[PDB]
Ligand binder design. Sequence first.
Ligand SMILES: Nc1ncnc2c1ncn2[C@H]1C[C@H](O)[C@@H](COP(=O)(O)OP(=O)(O)OP(=O)(O)O)O1
Ligand SMILES: [Mg+2]
Length: 373
Amino acid sequence: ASSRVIVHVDLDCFYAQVEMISNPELKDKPLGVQQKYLVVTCNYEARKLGVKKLMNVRDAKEKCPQLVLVNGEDLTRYREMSYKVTELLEEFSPVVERLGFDENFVDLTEMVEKRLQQLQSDELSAVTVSGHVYNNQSINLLDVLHIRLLVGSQIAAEMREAMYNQLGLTGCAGVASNKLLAKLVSGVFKPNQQTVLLPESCQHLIHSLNHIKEIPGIGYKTAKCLEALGINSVRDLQTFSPKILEKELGISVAQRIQKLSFGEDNSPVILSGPPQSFSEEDSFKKCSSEVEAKNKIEELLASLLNRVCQDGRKPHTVRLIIRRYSSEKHYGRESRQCPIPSHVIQVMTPMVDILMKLFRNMTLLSVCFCNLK
DNA sequence: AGGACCC
DNA sequence: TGGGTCCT
Ligand SMILES: Nc1ncnc2c1ncn2[C@H]1C[C@H](O)[C@@H](COP(=O)(O)OP(=O)(O)OP(=O)(O)O)O1
Ligand SMILES: [Mg+2]
């Protein structure tokens, strides 16, 4: 083990794609999916007209006074489709990592080897790429690594083909030697296409970023910390002092994101498997009297119970989270965790009050069934 | 419990 | 600004 062939699959405007399959009349027409006062996602037709994801419904219609909107506050169908995609990819190779509802990582390393071993000392020269090659780099058919990434692009092509035939879904794929690069290159040719990255082009891809914040792994926070240090470009981070950085973010985060700035990411593809938790949420115009407004909570449990059930396993912990309006609390949530009565495990009534007492001990309300077994 | 990070 | 995951 040493050289991996990873693939990053990223579905195009996933929610719109599901809504469109539902009611076809929505195709070719600018379609935006709405949650409260936001247009979380939209089909490309609409993006052409200026609709950008996570855009105010207003800023959205006064940019495209024709945009069709559907409500996407209920993630049931999306979720269901998200697992259908993951499963299909699990077929090609079991080790699949989900990143949100629309992303998956697959370690194709073992699969590329098996395929290569079936090729004869001739046909191995007829190996061809499938899709784009980043920075239009030249392929060297004698470079074993090149042969491997190209095979990976074929498999990548196959998965994309299967997704569309079997599930009616289009999307992108990125093939590289680690998760960071694969995710970075999957977006190069945006609408429903695929790109493969050859080693020689790693820095080019890394340096094409305009801000460290663009590097998967570096969030909103870490970015601001780095700024406060005069670290703005990816090369600033590459050339910055190991000591100082290590001494201000933690030898961990430090040593890790600096490897990242170079295109280095040794993290494995974790097998996601079944969810580690189930939760429903609900935001509402500061509309909760601090009581009686727990009929909403009864609502959450309704669906959740239907979900936690279906799964098969049973959760051994419940939780409640809340919010409070006032100033601009850029981060403010509160939750009361608690074990679930063994008897009650094996129905609403009990639970209802269970959350109620958890309620009292304490704009948005959400229940979460975690600790599954 | 709460934090960071991701989509 | 509707869900999730893993670390402190
Ligand atoms: N539901 C969400 N809530 C908050 N932030 C989000 C959400 N989804 C994505 N983001 C963040 C992640 C990134 O910082 C950025 C979005 O990247 P992204 O939306 O995937 O680009 P995109 O043009 O490819 O959209 P899409 O994948 O729908 O086609 O916003
Ligand atoms: Mg996206």
